[PDB]
Amino acid sequence: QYEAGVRPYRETYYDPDYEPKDTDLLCAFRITPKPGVPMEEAAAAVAAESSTGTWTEVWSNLLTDLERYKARCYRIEGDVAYIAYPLDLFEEGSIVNIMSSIVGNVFGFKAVQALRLEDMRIPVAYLKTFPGPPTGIQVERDRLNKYGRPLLGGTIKPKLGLSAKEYARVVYECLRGGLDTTKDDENLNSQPFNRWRDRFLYVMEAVRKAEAETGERKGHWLNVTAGSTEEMLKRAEFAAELGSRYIMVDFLTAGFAAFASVRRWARENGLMLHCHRAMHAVFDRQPNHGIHFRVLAKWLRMVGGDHVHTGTVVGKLEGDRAETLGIADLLREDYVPADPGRGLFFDQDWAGLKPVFPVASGGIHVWHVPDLVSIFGDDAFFLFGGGTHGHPRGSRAGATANRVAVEAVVQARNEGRDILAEGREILEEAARSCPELREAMELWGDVKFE
Amino acid sequence: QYEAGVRPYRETYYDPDYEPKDTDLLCAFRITPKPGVPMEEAAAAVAAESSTGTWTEVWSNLLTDLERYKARCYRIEGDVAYIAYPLDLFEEGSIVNIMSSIVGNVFGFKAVQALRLEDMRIPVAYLKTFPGPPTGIQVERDRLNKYGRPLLGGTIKPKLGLSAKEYARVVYECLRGGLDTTKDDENLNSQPFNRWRDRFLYVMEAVRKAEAETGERKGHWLNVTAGSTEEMLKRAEFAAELGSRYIMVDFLTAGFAAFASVRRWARENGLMLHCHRAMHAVFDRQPNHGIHFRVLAKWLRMVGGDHVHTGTVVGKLEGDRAETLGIADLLREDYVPADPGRGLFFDQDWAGLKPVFPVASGGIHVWHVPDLVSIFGDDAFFLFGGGTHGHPRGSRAGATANRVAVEAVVQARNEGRDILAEGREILEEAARSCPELREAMELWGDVKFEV
Amino acid sequence: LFEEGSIVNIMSSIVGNVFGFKAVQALRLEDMRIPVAYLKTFPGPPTGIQVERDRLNKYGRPLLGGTIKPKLGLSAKEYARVVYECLRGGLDTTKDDENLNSQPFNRWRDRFLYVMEAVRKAEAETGERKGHWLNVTAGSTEEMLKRAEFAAELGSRYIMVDFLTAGFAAFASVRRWARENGL
Amino acid sequence: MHTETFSYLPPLTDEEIKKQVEYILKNGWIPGIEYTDEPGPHNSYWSFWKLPFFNAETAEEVMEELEACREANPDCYIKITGYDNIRQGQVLSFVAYRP
Amino acid sequence: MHTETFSYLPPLTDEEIKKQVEYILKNGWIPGIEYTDEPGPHNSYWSFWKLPFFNAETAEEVMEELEACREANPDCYIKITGYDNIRQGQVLSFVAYRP
Amino acid sequence: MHTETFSYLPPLTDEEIKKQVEYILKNGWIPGIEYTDEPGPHNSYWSFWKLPFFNAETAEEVMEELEACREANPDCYIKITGYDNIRQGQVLSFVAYRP
Amino acid sequence: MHTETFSYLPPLTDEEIKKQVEYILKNGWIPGIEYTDEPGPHNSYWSFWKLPFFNAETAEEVMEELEACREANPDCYIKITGYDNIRQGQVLSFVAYRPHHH
Ligand SMILES: O=C(O)[C@@](O)(COP(=O)(O)O)[C@H](O)[C@H](O)COP(=O)(O)O
Ligand SMILES: O=C(O)[C@@](O)(COP(=O)(O)O)[C@H](O)[C@H](O)COP(=O)(O)O
Ligand SMILES: [Mg+2]
Ligand SMILES: [Mg+2]
Ligand SMILES: [Mg+2]
């Protein structure tokens, strides 16, 4: 009663005459087929097994309208396949569903030996089913009363091992020395040497004390990351009871469903949400396989994070300058045109969703500030962990050095100076009035990353 | 008051004199250093930046006991660095915490061009802080009243696009034809063409009907995967209201914190929990960089899944025979000795945690059944999606073919026949009493994947 | 053989029936080695010595306390007068007697209210942080948690429980509640 | 009415049944016999014929008990079980006689 | 008392303040002047000096208003603001005069 | 205003202070100095004088820093601390100078 | 026992049934045949007679399958269905044969 048997995926799932609709979700995949498998069949397999298809024809295909629902590869350029997915394929508001289709099984087929999702065009009609950041850059700056410069932060170190009381001592020194924020390390959750309730309590004493002493509003990114959603929400509740402006979630290790739970809680309780991308380099680093960070950044803005780490380019963790410029635009602008020089494969309209602060962190110190300001502009956080507490005179002096560095470079940029050409000179000028900065420059002047 | 400045990581975090404790968590990392960076320094960077250290010395290091708390690379062998993490570094019962340390930042360092987490030794004292499977193999067989053979299942197809009522018609035909279970596709959650409440309602009518008509207990793995934890629990609650024995979660795409929430809810509400590993190959496909599935499988058993997919070896998705045998032992046994030939760098004692069903699924059909029984033994689910609905006479006939093939091979094995040497003959003998199997064999006899 | 995190289970096996056998005329449990893997299933103290010294801001000496006397019979207001005199004289803490719970001459809500006025007053006057070990011991777990909740509402740093007379299952309930409520 | 393992194969002969009993014994598991006139999915607890045969040494001894159970209960379904006390679970169960 | 952007640098000269106003104007943003005797972190709404200078064409016009605000309110902190109506957000704010 | 350990004894002389510093050093703990003009029970975080003296080898070195802190902050209370990094906690804290 | 569409009309002749099959086919819908001995309102899933006739081109083809179903299942109610895969819904369903005990 039907034609049973195996068919080529290309027959149904490759259609080079197809014109994408503005409601389609588009994927750019870089494909390494198994030897002898042509790009068209490899791309069709990806399209089929992320949408409606399987490995042999089934009688029940005839009970629905596969021409309407199927994903289809509609263009191949070299090793890049462009695949269009109809809007109807996706659950509204669910990044979990996007991943379960687009990256669910298709990275593990014998027929495709490597696969990298380079970019995705999320259509406006799907974006509007997401709430975006619970706060967003502009409201966050209003809540902080801070305008006109990058914001300063810093991870407390050692990563693990400090008691709650001494942990908050480090927070107090940093914040009172001029950092706007401090943060728990991504792996500091609740442990025998530092239990979360003790930490939250003492840290918030230190935040309030530094705010009173400096006159500037302060925050600490209290890490609510935990083993279950309920436990994360319990930790968030205590942060709100203490009047923290902030909580923090490791959105990939906790995972997207728990992250969405925490975003809703943050919005309803008036807390801003720092997002740490722990685990991302497991699969966003190699050029032949995984998911490029720019796709993760899009998903992050959709669920709703107020900030996400984007790399530094110049510090201890890998990051490409051109790609990072594109990611910063994806996180902050209303509309981002395609740009092959930045690996932006598609135009991205953001449908009015609020913007996310890029966060530059990891192995950076005062000498990187001209580069960081040049790359990111004002709407970013620059975090100095080792680069604060590793100051020869400790964390208050280190914080002051970093705050002065950022302000001196902003001032110079606003006056019209080329902060890349004059970066060292601007720092040297500022160090004439700031011995903390002079000492930081001397300590780390030989410390460069490729 | 202290010696500020940058020191090589190896000064503090490389200690080949260190002897691992029974309470340490151990990792085996395959490291490709940046050219010019010695293996010792690359391994110490990984050790430092997944535990206590950073890129420059800090005054506050002296306020704690880094000798007690630091991770230490204690052995480098070829391209593998062995790193020991003290028990105190970890949050009890939290896979999320394990990941945030072990795989949080270290895969992105400029100093290490590629990094592959091959295995980790979870210490018994830490394992006891985890609940394990909500049901586990033995209790699940008791709940199903099924003993002595692999269990049969199958994903409904097309993956997406069937209405709820016709989706349930396919479920009904499969279950009444002899599959023990059926499942939602991993990407079928709630969508315009098939909304989850409609699907759950009709599917459970079909499950009850097939159970009553066959006399055998049935289940459908109702996918509760959703955008938020609260939504997943709402879907689980409805499945329990409907008397489903099962729900399903995509534990990696939902993520480990929401997975733990679903495990607790499933346990408290009497549901068994199928775990689909969607997204795993994003992390685990390449041999030079990422996390091998065996590590994800350990974490799965700890949080508590009743089944997880393990690969077929012989089907459409990649999976090596030796590594799959290692993963099956990790999921099912009380104690698993090391064997680097299977990628098991450490011995793993499971501290009494319940076992997980391996699930073999993807591109398999009746001709694979002798190999599947040989690889997995009785304690596995074999899933036939296309291999059921793609039968020339449809899903009931396909289900019967698959059930007969499994039973015939189990029978022959138990009698002492060599099911590899005689696999074809066993199937041919069974097909003389089972036209459905004969037709499945004719249809797919030329369909093979490389192994 | 043991249920994770349950002292009650340990007791029910180890000391459940074996002390009453005719075959064994006397039996004394001297010690037990709790294995590390089982210990990790228990949370331990809600605060512990180091965090408690941090909360008190007290370092380098034994801490001072004292049970209010007579054990029973003082009104709530005069009970708190004795607390005030003790704390303002240099004790770090004071405590309810173990058998002072809620009784006709001194009901727990009255005592908790007045005692915390005295604690705050002595703290303000001496400049040193003070506490009173408000006894939440009661006939049922729910009643104990109700008393703990009021102590937290009043900003007490402490509550007290008679862990053997209340019993280990209710003690675990109070430990969890104390931890979650900052006591 | 299907009866779980081997129900989709032709009914087992005495010699086929005996080979499954030999498999149970070879693996060191405990053979047992259970019977019922209510075999449906509501029933987790068929009637025991005697106790599980902890002391059985040969498949022939089990086969004799199967014949005795059938003579006493010819109106019942009768199943052979095999129990593994190390996993605390049944490891094989199939119907040997249908009324 | 620190006053947010540029508070960790030496107090700005009039020439330095004018350059920041020139930056506000070059970017198409709206310069404004606010003042208060309560500059602490509780205070989100300093007093406006007139309205935001929507019509200002030159930095010199803004500096004249700053001097006039300084002369009327020499006991107050005085800040320069720059507003971007396209993002609906302040894009630069710093104290130009401290009492 | 009492100041916790030794506050109920007569104020310590320099020689008595030095003996407590010797006790801190003898036990391998880290001496530190903190000061404040707000010593009451609301304040968990007095101002650090420099950093904890991780590198101190003699009680005389600590006593010299105490004299320097007092010369710089004669209007403050000044306390000697001793920190044990193995317990991650302070093990002795007392006031050495009152304004 | 009423049987939904056309149940309130006189039981259909074979010629009347065939006209309804011709209507299903004319509209490009998929004819099907289902049967049961439990037709009441609890039953959403009658037994399929084969699969839906995806390849049927003539009403006579379907009528032959109806007769074959009735001969094999004379104790059963037998209904004709029409399915529209573009709406993913059944568009016509009616009983063509009732057993003698009706
Ligand atoms: O754990 C760490 O190494 C850090 O605290 C940096 O410490 P330092 O400031 O002392 O370098 C941050 O988590 C990384 O920057 C995250 O990497 P990314 O931002 O690329 O996600
Ligand atoms: O979507 C699919 O392809 C499947 O439904 C198989 O369908 P078929 O039965 O028709 O092949 C399963 O999800 C895969 O087996 C999962 O891969 P794995 O088990 O390796 O995680
Ligand atoms: Mg970190
Ligand atoms: Mg699937
Ligand atoms: Mg007493």
Author numbering:
A (entry chain A): 5 to 454
B (entry chain B): 5 to 455
C (entry chain B): 93 to 275
D (entry chain F), E (entry chain E), F (entry chain F): 1 to 99
G (entry chain G): 1 to 102
What does the paper say about this structure?
Here we use the evolution of a new essential subunit in the protein complex of the CO2-fixing enzyme Rubisco to understand the genetic and structural mechanisms that have maintained this interactions’ essentiality for over 2 billion years of evolution. Modern-day Form I Rubiscos assemble into a complex of eight catalytic large subunits (LSUs) and eight non-catalytic, accessory small subunits (SSUs, L8S8 complex). Even though more ancestral forms of Rubisco exist and are functional without the SSU, all known Form I Rubiscos are strictly dependent on a SSU for solubility and activity. In prior work, we used ancestral sequence reconstruction to resurrect ancestral Rubiscos that existed before and after the SSU first appeared (named AncL and AncLS, respectively).
We noticed that helix α4 (aa 261–274), which faces Rubisco’s central pore, was heavily substituted from AncL to AncLS and that three sites within that region changed to amino acids that are well conserved in Form I Rubiscos (R269W, E271R, and L273N). Introducing these substitutions into AncL+7 yielded a highly soluble Rubisco variant (AncL+7 REL) that exhibited ~90% decreased activity without AncSSU in our assays. Addition of AncSSU almost entirely recovered the activity of AncL+7 REL. The three substitutions (R269W, E271R, and L273N, abbreviated as REL) are localized in proximity to Rubisco’s dimer-dimer interface. Indeed, instead of forming an octamer, the AncL+7-based triple mutant AncL+7 REL was dimeric in the absence of AncSSU, as determined by mass photometry (MP). The addition of AncSSU recovered octamerization and led to the formation of canonical L8S8 complexes. This indicates that binding of AncSSU can compensate for the detrimental effect of these substitutions by holding together these weaker octamers. Because AncSSU bridges adjacent Rubisco dimers, it can provide extra stability to the inter-dimer interface. This, in turn, allows the dimer-dimer interface between LSU dimers to degrade through the accumulation of destabilizing substitutions, which are compensated by the SSU at the cost of dependence. In addition, we also noticed that AncL+7 REL (as well as all other constructs that form dimers instead of octamers without AncSSU) were drastically destabilized towards thermal denaturation (~30 °C), which was partially recovered by AncSSU addition.
